[PDB]
């Protein structure tokens, strides 16, 4: 085995609140004197089909919003919209507010979710932003408004908020400035995700992790070119590899003494011939939810 670890969640736990609007309850993020949650909290079951969020929000008063931080009712003194995120000004700055930034991540990048039920931390898991900007994850009992995050030194980088589930049962949401990842809208209408491809650079990081942990059967004599690798990659629904992806893998190459194009040759054969009933780090499938950065972090 080689464990998919989440970041420690403590700094995020102290920021999770319950947000209620009528019969709708979901999770909010309480930073300084502002609570962030999905704007679709202001919607009635009717409204969700084609909501006019400006008209719906104009109709709401400060007192239509119930914010609970543990046992404390917070006083809403202001309500506003940044894209698809509702911003509730409360009369108290969160005294547990960590140092934080809002970042927009790239498809293939990983992050931790603190899954919450009615403002209460329930669980933490590590996932990837799929190439089609969806998230495979949490069963979702009152999971709307649960946030994704990286910890960078002493700083929480908030990168994601859960808004909705798609037909396929994958999840979609926004950055903390309320812009969707992918072509999705907070409207109850049938919306297609792109083809979900495998994150090749992550699969290569994980083969590197397998070698570091002494799992070596899949190494072959062969090398390959980026060009010839990418033709095979595209046949099996794998993202094309670029020189930047080669450069990103450099530390794992140097540590293992296995060139990137030699590991690429190993992956090529695995795709063409399958695993012949064998496993790598105790998985029967190639794992793509570890970045090169994740493997380096955990192999130190």
């Amino acid at each position: 085995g080689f464990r998919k670890m989440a970041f420690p969640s403590g700094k995020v736990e102290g920021c999770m609140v319950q947000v209620t609007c009528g019969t709708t309850t979901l999770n909010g993020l309480w930073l300084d004197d502002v609570v962030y949650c999905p704007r679709h909290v202001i919607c009635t079951s009717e409204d969700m089909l084609n909501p006019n969020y400006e008209d719906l929000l104009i109709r709401k008063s400060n007192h239509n919003f119930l914010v609970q931080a543990g046992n404390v009712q917070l006083r809403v003194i202001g309500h506003s919209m940044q894209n698809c995120v509702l911003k509730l000004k409360v009369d108290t700055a969160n005294p547990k507010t960590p140092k934080y930034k809002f970042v927009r991540i790239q498809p293939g990048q990983t992050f931790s979710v603190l899954a919450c039920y009615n403002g209460s931390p329930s669980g933490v898991y590590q996932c990837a932003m799929r190439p089609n900007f969806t998230i495979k994850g949490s069963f979702l009992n009152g999971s709307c408004g649960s946030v994704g995050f990286n910890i960078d030194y002493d700083c929480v980088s908030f990168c994601y908020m859960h808004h909705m589930e798609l037909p396929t049962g994958v999840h979609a949401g926004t950055d903390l400035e309320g812009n969707f990842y992918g072509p999705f809208v907070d409207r109850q209408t049938a919306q297609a995700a792109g083809t979900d491809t495998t994150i090749t650079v992550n699969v290569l990081a994980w083969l590197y992790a397998a070698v570091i942990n002494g799992d070596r059967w899949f190494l072959n004599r062969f090398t390959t070119t980026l060009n010839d690798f990418n033709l095979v990659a595209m046949k099996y629904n794998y993202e094309p590899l670029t020189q930047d992806h080669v450069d990103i893998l450099g530390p794992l190459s140097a540590q293992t003494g296995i060139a990137v194009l030699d590991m690429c040759a190993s992956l090529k054969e695995l795709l063409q011939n399958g695993m012949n009933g064998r496993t790598i780090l105790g998985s029967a499938l190639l794992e793509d939810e570890f970045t090169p950065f994740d493997v380096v972090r955990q192999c130190s």
Binding site: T24, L26, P38, H40, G142, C144, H163, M164, E165, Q188
Partner: peptide, 4 residues
């Protein structure tokens, strides 16, 4: 599905 945006329930909840």
């Amino acid at each position: 599905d945006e329930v909840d």
